[PDB]
Design a binder for this molecule. Structure first.
Ligand SMILES: Cc1cc2nc3c(=O)[nH]c(=O)nc-3n(C[C@H](O)[C@H](O)[C@H](O)COP(=O)(O)OP(=O)(O)OC[C@H]3O[C@@H](n4cnc5c(N)ncnc54)[C@H](O)[C@@H]3O)c2cc1C
Lengths: 495, 501, 499, 492
C-alpha cells in the first residue's frame, strides 16, 4: 500500500486545478488532494513583483465571465467591495499613429481616406463571395479574409496573429474562433466610414494572482500540498500511483492532471504518448514589465490591452497595467533611483527621487519558426515603446521585469485536433482527466474562466456524470449564460 | 404542518416522472415521493389489452446510455426483448413505398417521377443561393423535397397527423440540418429503378417480449422503494398551492415540498394551481387528441404485410395517419394459435358464417387517428371507418375475419409545434420556475420533439439533476444538441455511488 | 394613271425622311420625291425664334459615320459649329449634383448617403445571384441603383418625363447591359468625398440657326425639283391598295414603295383602315410643352458652363432645363440689342418699360402632359418661371425679356409594357402593303427616336428597299449603339466605280 | 498599264469566291473578274469520283441554310424539283455499341443505367455551379464541362473534339460556339432519362454539282479557271496580281479567297508571313469505301466516333443521300478486298447493288497520320464499329489528303487574326473564307458563300460584314433582306 491514498488526485493549482479542488470540496464526497510544485497557487495566472515594488501579471486578466459558478468562487474569495475595481471593457489597435478602438473594422474611419478605400473594396469582394459561399473555411487565414477582406486582413489581423502565434495564419485551424459564419458586416463598416464615427473587475490588491491565492485559501489546508514537497516526478498510470520529489507515493482512483500534457507523458515514461505530444505545437512567451516615473500619458488612459500589428515593436500586446489598480505599483512617496531613460541613455542623477509611478506590461512570443534574441529583447521592447509613442525618449524607467515562459500559448494549428483526439482518449482509458490550458491544449478555452471550469466539469464528470461542456463544446458554453451550476447547489442545501 | 413532507415531489409516474424517480433514488440524497392518480405506472406509455387478449400500446430509439442502463436493469434477460429492423413504408397510390419516400419514388408512374425530380431540381438550385432559414414547417418541407414530393407525402400526411396546416407550424423542432435536397440520391434511385429503405442489420430497435411497451415502465417502477410511491386513487392530485409549496390529494392527504417536478399536463397544472394568469396562458397552447384503434385478425400474417412495422398514410382513403403490424413486434401481443375466438365481423362489415369459436393463429393491427377543433372525429363511427380504410389500403381483404376490436380516445395526444408555441411557452416555464416548479414532460413541458419515451424519461432525470447537482437541462432547452451526440456520461452508476463503500 | 409617279415616295421631311432622301439621292437609281406639309424642312427638329430674337429648339451624339458625312457636308467650315463638353446635373436637395447621380451622392447629407449605399449593397448582393432579366423599367432601376438612389432620382424623374409610373414601362429599350451596380465606384467617391461628371467627351452644336439649321442645310443638298414642301405637299389620303397618295391641292402621287415618316396613328387615319386605327389607338404617347425664357444679364456663375439639367423633385413642373445660351452666341441677341423687361422672375412688374441693352442668356424647359398627368395650358408658363426661382436658376430679381411656349401634341412615344405587342401587329401589316413606316412616331420606338437614329432609320429603310440591307437600327438598337458604324458612307464604292 | 484591269478581282472559286461573284454579277456595277487555279469550280466543296463510279464529297454538305440569298442562288442553279432529294436532318454518336441520337446528352437513356448515373451526377454539379457563375467560359473545355458536366464531357465531346481538331480542348477558345450561356438543361436531360426538319441534297453531281451549276450562271469571259488562272504573285502596293503564265491583273479592290498564309507568301510580305504562321490548322484525309450489297438495317446522316477503336471522327453512309452517288446495280465490278483485309477468291466482276461510306481523319503537327496505312486502319475501324461485316466486299476505295482542312479555333487565333485582316484591309484586300479569314464557325458553305456576298456588298454598297464579324447575330435570325432580285434590279 502507498504513502497516501485518495479517490481523486488533482495535480496543479492553477485555475484548472483549483476548479477541480473547489468542486471536490463543495461536493464533499470522495476523498481528494491537490498538489503543486509551487509554494504559491495560481500557475501562470500568478503575479510577480520586481525588487522595486511593481506588480506584473503573468497571464492576463478576465474581462468577461461565462459562468455563474466562476463568479461565485471569486465572490467567496474576495467578498468586499473594496477588493475589486471596475473598468470598462475596451481595447485599441495601434495602426499608423492612431489608436483605433476595438473592433478594428468598425473604426477604419481613422485611417487615411485612400486606405479606407482599399479596405472597403476588399470587404465588398468578401461580401459578394460570402453571398454564394457553401463551404466552411479551412484555415485561420481563410477565415480572416472571408470575414474582413484582403485590405483589412493585411492591416491588422494577418500581421497581428503572426506576432501572437509565431506561426503563419495559413498553418492554423479556425474552428476555435466559433461557429459565427465567416462573412463581413459590410453595412456596419461602411456606415461608420460614411458617418465618421460593459465592464470587468480587477483585484484591488495582489494583481490577478491574488484571486487564486484567495480562492486557494478556501480549501482545507490539510488537503493541499504546495511547493517542493508536492512536485510530481513519476506517474505510474498502471498502478494508479504518483511519486513526488521527496519520494512520497500517492495512490489514486481517478486523476485530474493540470500539468502540460507533454510533461505528463514524460512523467509516465510512456513513449507512445511522448511521441504524440511532441506533435503538438506551442509558443513561448516573454513577459516584460516597465515601471516609469511620472503620471501616465494623456492619450492612453483607460484600462485595456493594446494590440500592435506593426513592425516597429517586438510585442503583440501591451497594457498600461498601472491603470488597473493603484496597488500595482509604489506610492508616490516611495523613492527609487532612475535606472535608465527610455531612449537607452544613463540618467543625470543616480539619486533616489519620489514618484508618482506608472507601469507598462508587454508580451513577446517566441517559437521555432520565430526565434527571439534573449539578450536584447528587453531593450528592443523599450525601444518599441518609444516607437509607438507610449514612452517619451526622456521618460525615466525605475524598474524592469522580464520572465520567459516556455509553455506560453497552445497553438491551434491545423494538426492539433488530429493529435489531440489520439491523446485525450488514451489518457481517459487510463482514468486520467488531462485538462487545462496545456492539460488539454485548447487555447479557445484556455483563459481563466474556461480553465477554472474545465476542472470543475472534470470533477462533475467523475462524481455526478455531467457532460464536459467546456472541454468539448466551447461555442455552446460561450454562447449562453451558464447559471445552473452554483457554489451552493441543491445537494448541499438538502443536508 | 402538512401530512407528508419531502424535499422533491414528483407528480406523475409516466416516463418523465420515473426518470425523476430513478435519479432521485440513485443519488439517494434528498427525500422524495412520487404520486400518480393511476394505479398502473407508465402514463400514456402504458399498454391495454382487449377482453380477447390483444395488446395495444398508445417504438424506441435511445439517445442516452442512461436510458439504456435503466431498461437493461428493468428487463435484464435476453429473452425479455425482441430485436427488429426499422422497417417503415408510405402508402401512396397503391404502393408500399419504403421510407424515406424521396429515395423510392421509382415506384410511382414515370410521368409523376418527372414532376417530382423537376420539383427537387428547383429546390436544389434555390438551396444553392439560400441565405435565410426556413420560418414555417411548410417552408422546410418544400426546401427539402420540392413541390412535387412535398405534395405527395409530407404536406398531406402532417395535416392528418397534426390537424393543422403545415403553414401554421414552426420548424426549429426538426433540427438545424439545412433544408436542402440530396438531388443525386433521389435522382440516382430513379435512374436505377432501385428501392432501398432506411433500415438494415444495425438499424434496429428492441421491443418488450411481454407486456408491450407499458411492461418496460412496470419493470422500471418496480426497482423503486414501494413506500416512496403512492399510486392510484390514493395518489390523485387536486390542488397545488405554489405559494405555500404544498399539494393536496384526492383523499385529502397534503404533501409539502421544497421543489416540485410536475409531469401532468401544464394546462391541468395551471387549473390545479387556481392561477388565472397561468391558466390564461396555457389555454393559448394548441393540441390534438388521439384515437387509438386496434384490430385483431384471424390467420397467419399476410405476405403483403410482411415484416413491416409502421406505415404512413398521406392519402384520403382512410382516416388514420399511421398503422402498425403490432403482431410482428412480439408473439405475446396476441393470443396463442390454440386460443379459440369467434369472428366478430368481416373487414367489409358483413357477419361471419358461424358465431362458433375457431382457433387462430392471429395477427394484429393498431391505428392512430387524430382529432382537433379544425379536424373533428365522429366517436360513433371511427372504428368502422378505420376498418373500411384497412380494406381501401389493401391491408385487409374484404374476407378477413376480425376477432377483436379496440378503441380508446386520449384527450391530450400531441402537443402541437405551432408558430405561437415558443412565444407562449417562454412565458409559462419562467413563471413556474420562479415558484420552484419544474414542469417537464410531453405535456409537462409541451415540446413534441423531446416528447417520445427516452427524451421524456431524461427530462425528468435532468430536472432532478438540475435540482440537486446544478446540471444543465440539456434535453429540455437544446434538443438538437442532445440528439446529435451520444450521451454516455450520465450512467445508472456514477462515481458518486461508487465512492460510497 | 395618276398625276405624279415615282419609285420610292418619302412622306415627311424630318430627319427620318431626310435620311431616306439623302440616301435615295446618293444611290441615284430609282426615281423619288419627298413631301412635307411644312414649308420648312426639319420637322420636330426645327428651331423657333421669339419676336425678341431668342432661338429655341424642341443635343446630338452620332453612332454612324454616315450621319457625320451628311452633317459635315451640310456645314463644312469649322466656324459653322461649336464644341462643348457633355455637362449635365441633377437638381437634388438644394445641390447641383454632377451626372451620373450615384457617383456624386457625396453632396447629400451623411444620413442620406447611408441609406443610398445600404440600398446599393442590397442591390449588389441580389445581382450576385440574379438569374432573371428585369421585366419592368422600375425593376431595372432598382437593380441598378438600389432603393435609396432610385427614389431620389431615376424613379421620380422618369415619372415627370413619361407621365406614366416606371412600373408600367418596359426596359428592353435601355439595352442589354446587365442591371447591376458598380458599388465600388459609388462607395469610393463617398469615402473620398469626390464629385466628378462624365465629361474630352464633347458634342457639337450649330453656330447659327439652332438645331433646325442643320436640317435646313442638309435639305439644301437635295435636288430642288424632287421636293414639294408646304401647303402644296400636305398629304391627306394614302390609298394603300392602289399605291397612291393624294395631297391637299388634290395632286395624286403614285409610288412603287412608300417610306412614311409621319406619326403612324395619323398614317392609319389617312389610309382609312379601321383595323389599323384600332391598333394604333392602343399605343400610348405623351405631349410636350417647350418653354423658353430670355433673361437679361451676363450669365450667372451659379449656372456656369452647364448644359442640360434634370429635375426629379416636386418644386417645379419641368423635368429638364437647358442653358440654351451656352450652346451658341447666336441663339439670342447681341448685348447691343435693346429690349424692355417684360416681368421679373418673382412675377412683379419691372421698374421701367424702357428698353435697355443686354447681354442676354436663355433657358429652355420641357414639361410633359398625358391623361395620367394633365397640364394647365393657361398657367404652365408662370408655373415654370416660379420653378426657375424655386430651383435657384433665377433670382426673384432677374429681368425676363422674352417668353416662349409651344405645345407639341406628339412628344414622346412611350415605351410601355404593351408597346411591342401592339407594334408587332402594326408594322408587319403596313409592311405587307409596301409601306416602310419609320421614325420617332412612324415606328414609335423611342430608343431609336433621336436625330442620329431617326436619320438612319430613313437611310436603312431605303437601303432595304434598293440594296436588301438589314434594317439594323429599327430592329436591333443595342447592336448599332454598341459598335462604331463606319461601313456606310456618303460616298460608297458604287459611286466611285462610276466616275 | 497591265494585261487586264478591273475594279474588283476575286481570287478563288470555292463557295466564298462564287458568293463574291454572284453578288458582283447581280449588282452589275463595277467591272470584275474571278480566277481559280482549278479548272473545276467549287473548291473544297467539290465532288470526286473513283475510277469505279463512286462519288465522294470533299467537303461535306449543308444541313441548314441561314440566308434566303444562299437559297435563291441554289434555286437558280438547280431549279427543277427532281434536281434535289429531301432528307431528315439528324446525326448519331457511336458510344459503347450504341448509335446515340443527337443531341448526345438528351439521349443517354440508351447507355447502361450505371453510366447514366455518372452522367446525371456530373450534370447536377454543372447545374449548381452555373447557378452562381458570374464569368463566361474561357476555354472550349470550360464550355464543355459547364454545359454537359464531367461524365458527359468524357464520353463524347472531349474525346471527339481531340479526334477532330488534334489539339486538347483546353487550348481552344469557345466564342465560336455562340452566345448561348454555358449552363445545362438538367430538367430536359433528366426527363428523357426517366421516360426513356429536313435538308436538301443534290440528286446528281454530289455537293460539288451545286457549285458547278452556280458558276454556270456567271458570264464565261469574266472567269479564268485552271492553270491559266493560278495566282503566283500579289503586289499589294501596285494593286496588281501576277498569274502562272505571267499575265498581270490589276485591281482597285481585291477579294482573296485563298488561304491567308498562302496569300502572305504571294505578297512576299514577311510581316504577314510571320503572322500567318502563328495560325494553327489541321489536314484532312477523306476516305471513301464502295461496298457491294444493300445498306445495313440506316438514314441519311453524319456519324460521330469519339472512341479509340477507329481513326476517323465522322463517317457518313454517302449512298443514302442519292442513288446517283454510286453505280447502278447492273454495273459489274470485281471485289477488291474484304473488310477483314483479305483478298477475294475470284477476279470475277459481279453485279451490285452498291453502297458507299465516307470517312474523315484529321492530321496535325500534334497528330501525325501514317499515309501508307490510314486507309487500311479506317477499313478496320469500320469493322470495329460494326458498319462493315468482316466479309463485306469492297469494290472501290478513295483516299485524298487535304493540307488545309480545318482552321483551328485556338485560344491564340483571334489575337493573331486581328493583326492580319486589318493590315490586309488597309491594303484594300478582303481576305475572306474558310481559310481566307480562318474562322471555322463561318466556314461551312452557306456562311462562306455569304462571306463573299457581304464582302462585295461592303465594297460597293457600304454594307456591314455581318457574317464575318457577328456569326451569332446572323445565326440567331432569319436573313431574308438580301435577295438575288433586289429593288435595285427591279428599278432598272
Ligand atoms: C501569456 C499568457 C496570457 C494569458 N492571458 C490571459 C488573458 O488575457 N485573459 C485570461 O482570462 N487568461 C489569460 N491567461 C490564462 C491563464 O494564465 C491560464 O489559464 C492559467 O495558467 C490556467 O491554466 P491551467 O491551470 O490549466 O495551467 P497552469 O496554471 O499553467 O498550470 C497549473 C499548475 O500546474 C503546476 N505543475 C506543473 N507541473 C507540475 C508537476 N510536475 N508537479 C506539480 N505541479 C506541477 C504548475 O506549476 C502550475 O502551478 C493567459 C495565460 C498566459 C500564459
Amino acid at each position: 500500500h502507498p504513502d497516501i491514498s485518495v479517490d481523486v488526485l488533482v495535480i496543479g493549482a492553477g485555475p484548472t486545478g483549483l476548479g477541480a479542488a473547489k468542486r471536490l470540496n463543495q461536493i464533499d464526497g470522495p476523498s481528494w488532494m491537490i498538489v503543486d510544485s509551487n509554494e504559491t497557487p495560481g500557475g501562470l495566472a500568478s503575479t510577480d513583483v520586481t525588487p522595486e515594488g511593481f506588480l506584473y501579471d503573468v497571464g492576463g486578466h478576465v474581462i468577461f465571465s461565462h459562468y455563474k459558478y466562476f463568479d461565485d468562487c471569486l465572490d467567496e474569495a474576495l467578498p468586499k467591495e473594496d477588493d475589486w475595481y471596475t473598468h470598462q471593457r475596451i481595447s485599441y489597435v495601434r495602426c499608423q499613429g492612431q489608436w483605433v478602438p476595438y473592433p478594428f473594422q468598425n473604426n477604419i474611419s481613422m485611417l487615411p481616406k485612400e486606405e479606407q478605400v482599399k479596405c472597403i473594396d476588399g470587404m465588398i469582394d468578401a461580401a459578394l463571395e460570402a453571398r454564394v459561399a457553401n463551404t466552411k473555411p479551412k484555415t485561420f487565414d481563410e477565415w480572416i479574409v472571408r470575414m474582413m477582406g484582403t485590405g483589412i486582413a493585411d492591416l491588422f489581423m494577418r500581421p497581428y496573429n503572426f506576432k501572437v502565434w509565431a506561426v503563419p495564419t495559413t498553418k492554423m485551424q479556425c474552428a476555435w474562433l466559433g461557429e459565427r459564419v465567416a462573412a463581413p458586416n459590410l453595412k456596419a463598416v461602411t456606415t461608420n466610414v460614411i458617418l465618421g464615427k460593459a465592464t470587468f473587475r480587477f483585484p484591488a490588491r495582489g494583481g490577478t494572482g491574488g484571486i487564486w491565492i484567495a480562492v486557494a485559501n478556501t480549501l482545507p489546508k490539510e488537503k493541499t500540498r504546495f511547493g517542493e514537497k508536492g512536485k510530481v516526478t513519476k506517474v505510474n498510470a498502471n498502478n494508479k500511483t504518483v511519486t513526488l520529489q521527496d519520494g512520497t507515493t500517492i495512490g489514486y482512483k481517478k486523476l485530474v492532471s493540470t500539468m502540460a500534457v507533454d510533461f505528463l507523458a514524460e512523467a509516465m515514461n510512456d513513449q507512445e504518448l511522448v511521441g504524440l505530444t511532441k506533435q503538438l505545437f506551442y509558443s513561448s512567451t516573454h513577459v516584460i514589465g516597465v515601471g516609469v516615473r511620472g503620471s501616465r500619458p494623456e492619450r492612453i488612459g483607460d484600462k485595456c490591452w493594446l494590440y500592435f500589428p506593426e513592425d516597429n515593436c517586438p510585442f503583440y500586446r501591451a497594457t498600461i497595467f498601472s491603470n488597473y489598480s493603484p496597488y500595482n505599483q509604489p506610492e508616490a512617496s516611495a523613492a527609487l533611483p532612475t535606472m535608465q531613460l527610455a531612449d537607452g541613455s544613463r540618467p543625470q542623477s543616480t539619486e533616489a527621487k519620489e514618484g508618482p509611478y506608472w507601469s507598462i506590461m508587454l508580451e513577446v512570443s517566441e517559437s521555432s519558426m520565430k526565434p527571439v534574441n534573449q539578450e536584447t529583447i528587453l531593450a528592443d521592447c523599450i525601444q518599441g515603446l518609444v516607437n509607438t509613442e507610449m514612452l517619451k525618449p526622456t521618460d525615466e524607467i525605475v524598474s524592469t521585469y522580464h520572465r520567459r515562459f516556455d509553455h506560453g500559448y497552445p497553438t491551434p494549428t491545423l494538426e492539433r485536433e488530429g493529435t489531440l483526439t489520439q491523446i485525450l482518449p488514451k489518457l481517459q482509458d487510463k482514468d486520467i482527466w488531462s485538462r487545462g490550458r496545456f492539460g488539454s491544449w485548447r487555447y479557445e478555452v484556455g483563459n481563466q474562466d474556461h480553465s477554472f471550469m474545465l476542472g470543475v466539469e472534470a470533477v462533475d464528470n467523475i462524481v455526478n456524470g455531467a457532460v464536459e461542456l467546456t472541454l468539448n463544446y466551447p461555442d455552446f458554453v460561450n454562447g449562453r449564460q451558464n447559471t445552473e451550476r452554483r457554489l451552493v447547489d441543491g445537494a448541499q442545501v438538502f443536508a
